[PDB]
Write a protein that binds this ligand. Structure first.
Ligand SMILES: COc1ccc(-c2cc3c(C)nc(N)nc3n([C@H]3CC[C@H](OCCO)CC3)c2=O)cn1
Length: 847
């Protein structure tokens, strides 16, 4: 085969790493996992309905929220069906099927698409339940359909494809031959057997002089028995001299359940600059010329050794147990707590809330305990039956659980999330893949299934993986094998779509990096920008291409005219495009920023948390009006960002009538708003939208501990909606304010200095509801914030950083104590006025 063999050269193109390579493995686990994934891919490609798949309706079973029924006149939604230019309006009921809006139009074969978008209102679902509709209602807008012909399913077609460990009482051991580094103190090697961040045993070698080569040739006997090693155990090898210098890991029980034996030479990872996820990888360093290396031997018998495969209680105790179950994810367990959870494990099994703590009371270094823990997993009914709790589910998937049966039951719980909910957590489920001991895992397969099943999940899963494959040497192989599996099943139609997007953005990067090397901006630089963008619009670049942060959008021709290079430290591009779709109601460009020099992974994590907060507020009928704009990492330290329309900085609004100073004037923003409002009616709404959006960002920003911001990184729209930007900037550099509530903001609210008003009391009372709303999900947010810090921004691990959020969410405190607490934060804002903002001005503009 060849035509079905040049293919892999395209996949290796889309993936961005050569999955067939072997230059950096010490076993066949990746190969075994690729083979492993073939079955779940074809299972799902065969199992998906061709229609619904090709048109990926975007649907939701959650109730239509209150604040949107009130926006429906009376059981009456208006849709505008476009033919050519012969429009037409219809009175449709919220509970109306989409087809039925054809038994009601073919009365005065075909499918309804959305004007300007790749979105289809298809399938048996009430229109109240299509996201694009809900997006229309929320922003008060006519719903436009183009009414045309189905895409053809046939274009989504995929092209044609021994001794039992439990009989070994010998203490386990490993020989350290020694270490070699090509180029350079006293030095030694530390060997740990870890399971799930739990350390089972430790031994070291004697210290030695640090030279180009250091040999010991010692056996290190561990205090743990061969039969007592759990599946997922890591041998963790480290090098000290006290500071840590190099680490590497090796699974002691391989993907085949074999105790691991023989000679191993492993190139090790360095430490730059408390644990992030890179510390956990089974992947060996690819870079050999440079990397410290270690050489070991594992005993090597014949001799394949395969890992095989309730009463009452007092009352002081029960309440002690209840107090433990309740405590938050980050609150530590004493030995005393653990022995208690374990002894009363059966009474602990009735409370799913308890599972994270129960399965952390387990000594995984003991066969018989693990064996009892598996009996525990067989009596799992209460967990199996209870309503899905994503907060619970994520905790079992973090770095604290290495047993795959514990992790599998969390994944079981996820299988019952509707698509919509999958998109909310997708980014973090993919980061959670870094915590899996093995390349092939239930969570890895599950992400594969849900992608292959829904082009929308699938489009994002593509980019999230490609971002990691592009900037993570620790996990690229594994992510490569998951991407590869996904691409070989998405459909040739998707495959061509992904290829377009890749071709375009790769070009644009080149431009970006190139203009970047010429350096505020010279009109020499402004010149080449326009020039290269003209090159592109030629005989390479395809006509259009899906915008990656918003898959429903096709971008077409650029707008050379409007595109610019901005005056940042780095030189990011400000590009704009035409909607490639003629059926577009408007003619506004699609505006996208391109930047090198920031790791955009971190901004992605924050934005997606923001969407989750907006989703938590919808449960309580709150719309705090955030603008979590699109952001997609596409490669090392580089990617794109969506541009929000009709928006300036708050600092620019000040600099407009004070001119680069700090003489910030309390009345300037409310004057800018009135300045841009055609009616005092629109103006009132922009003031209403301000109060919500600003409150919304005070709470979220405060919980996430990124509320103390420079005035240049807070923006607003000509319509009152306020939003923060550039979250990577405070995260990735690290007198104080909790969030940013400034004299100009308060002034817009009807309060001066130390006063009060109907809008400010509206403000405070949206904050309180908001703040309390999030604390109802204290466990969700604590695990997400913790997993965020671990997989996304190293340096910000330590532990002490991770625990900021417990303080913020005020765990333990009762609502009334908590309500008061936030209001006091607001009051720290009223007190400092322009202080910090002025400080941020001196520092960030004058050093
Ligand atoms: C993590 O990296 C980054 C980098 C850039 C942004 C970013 C987002 C943004 C959005 C979503 N919407 C609108 N409307 N603008 C935006 N801007 C503008 C700020 C003012 C600037 O003007 C400088 C001369 O005054 C022009 C660009 C941004 O920078 C966010 N994160």
């Amino acid at each position: 085969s060849e035509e079905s063999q040049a293919f892999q050269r395209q996949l290796t193109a889309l993936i961005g790493y050569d999955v067939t390579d072997v230059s950096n493995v010490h076993d066949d686990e990746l190969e075994f996992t690729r083979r492993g994934l073939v079955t779940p891919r074809m299972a799902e490609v065969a199992s998906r309905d061709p229609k619904l798949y090709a048109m990926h309706p975007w649907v939701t079973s959650k109730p239509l929220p209150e604040y949107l029924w009130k926006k429906i006149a009376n059981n009456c939604i208006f849709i505008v069906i476009h033919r050519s230019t012969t429009s037409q309006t219809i009175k449709v009921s919220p509970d109306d099927t989409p087809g039925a809006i054809l038994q009601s139009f073919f009365t005065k074969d075909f499918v309804l698409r959305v004007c300007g978008r790749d979105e289809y209102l298809v399938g048996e679902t009430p229109i109240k339940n299509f996201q694009w509709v809900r997006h229309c209602l929320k922003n008060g807008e006519e719903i436009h359909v183009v009414l045309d012909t189905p895409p053809d399913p046939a274009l989504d077609e995929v092209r044609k494809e021994t001794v039992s460990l439990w009989d070994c009482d010998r203490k386990f051991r490993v020989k350290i031959r020694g270490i070699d580094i090509p180029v350079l103190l006293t030095v030694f090697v530390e060997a740990n057997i870890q399971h799930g961040q739990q350390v089972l045993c430790q031994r070291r070698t004697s210290p030695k002089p640090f030279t180009e080569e250091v040999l010991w040739n010692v056996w290190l006997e561990f205090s743990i028995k061969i039969k007592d090693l759990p599946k997922g155990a890591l041998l963790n090898l480290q090098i000290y001299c006290v500071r840590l210098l190099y680490y590497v890991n090796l699974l002691l029980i391989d993907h085949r359940f074999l105790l691991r034996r023989g000679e191993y030479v492993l190139h090790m990872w360095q430490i730059s600059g408390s644990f992030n996820a890179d510390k956990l990888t089974s992947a060996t360093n690819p870079d050999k010329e440079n990397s410290m290396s270690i050489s070991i031997l594992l005993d090597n018998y014949c001799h394949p050794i395969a890992l095989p495969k309730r009463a009452e209680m007092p009352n002081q105790l029960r309440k002690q147990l209840e107090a433990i179950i309740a405590t938050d994810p980050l609150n530590p367990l004493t030995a005393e707590d653990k022995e208690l959870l374990w002894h009363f494990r059966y009474e602990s099994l009735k409370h799913p809330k308890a599972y994270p703590k129960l399965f952390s009371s387990v000594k995984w270094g003991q066969q018989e305990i693990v064996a009892k823990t598996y009996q525990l997993l067989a009596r799992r009914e209460v967990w199996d039956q209870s309503a899905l709790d994503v907060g619970l589910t994520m905790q079992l998937l973090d770095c604290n659980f290495s047993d795959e049966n514990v992790r599998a039951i969390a994944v079981q719980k996820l299988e019952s999330l509707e698509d919509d909910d999958v998109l909310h957590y997708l980014l973090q489920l993919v980061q959670a893949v870094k915590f899996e001991p093995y390349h092939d895992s239930a969570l890895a397969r599950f992400l594969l299934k849900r992608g292959l099943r829904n082009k929308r999940i699938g489009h994002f899963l593509f980019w999230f993986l490609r971002s990691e494959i592009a900037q993570s040497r620790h996990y690229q192989q594994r992510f490569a094998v998951i991407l590869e599996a996904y691409l070989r099943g998405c459909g040739t139609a998707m495959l061509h779509d992904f290829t377009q997007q890749v071709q375009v953005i790769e070009m644009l990067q080149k431009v970006t990096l190139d203009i970047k090397s010429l350096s505020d901006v010279s009109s020499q630089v402004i010149s080449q920008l326009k020039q290269k963008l003209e090159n592109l619009q030629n005989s390479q670049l395809p006509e259009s291409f899906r915008v990656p942060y918003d898959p429903g959008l096709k971008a077409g021709a650029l707008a050379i005219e409007k595109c610019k290079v901005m005056a940042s430290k780095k030189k990011p591009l400000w590009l704009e495009f035409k909607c490639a779709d003629p059926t577009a109601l408007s003619n506004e460009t699609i505006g996208i920023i391109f930047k090198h020099g920031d790791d955009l992974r971190q901004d992605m994590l924050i934005l997606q948390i923001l969407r989750i907060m907006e989703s938590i507020w919808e449960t309580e009928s709150l719309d705090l009006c955030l603008l979590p704009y699109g952001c997609i990492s596409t490669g090392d330290k580089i990617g794109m960002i969506e541009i929000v329309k009709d928006a300036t900085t708050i600092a620019k609004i000040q600099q407009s009538t004070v001119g680069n100073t700090g003489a910030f004037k309390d009345e300037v923003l409310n004057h800018w708003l009135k300045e841009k409002s055609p009616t005092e009616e629109k103006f009132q709404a922009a003031v209403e939208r301000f109060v919500y959006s600003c409150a919304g960002y005070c709470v979220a920003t405060f919980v996430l501990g990124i509320g103390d911001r420079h005035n240049d990184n807070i923006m607003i729209t000509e319509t009152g909606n306020l939003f923060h930007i550039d979250f990577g900037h405070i995260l990735g550099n690290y007198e104080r304010v909790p969030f940013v509530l400034t004299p100009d903001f308060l002034f817009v609210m009807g309060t001066s200095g130390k006063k009060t008003s109907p809008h400010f009391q509206k403000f405070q009372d949206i904050c309180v509801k908001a703040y309390l709303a999030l604390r109802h999900h204290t466990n969700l947010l604590i695990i997400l914030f913790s997993m965020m810090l671990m997989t996304g921004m190293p340096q910000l691990t330590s532990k002490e950083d991770i625990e900021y959020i417990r303080d913020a969410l005020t765990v333990g405190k009762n609502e009334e104590d908590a309500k008061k607490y936030f209001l006091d934060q607001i009051e720290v804002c009223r007190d400092k006025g322009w202080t910090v903002q002025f400080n941020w001005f001196l520092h960030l503009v004058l050093g």
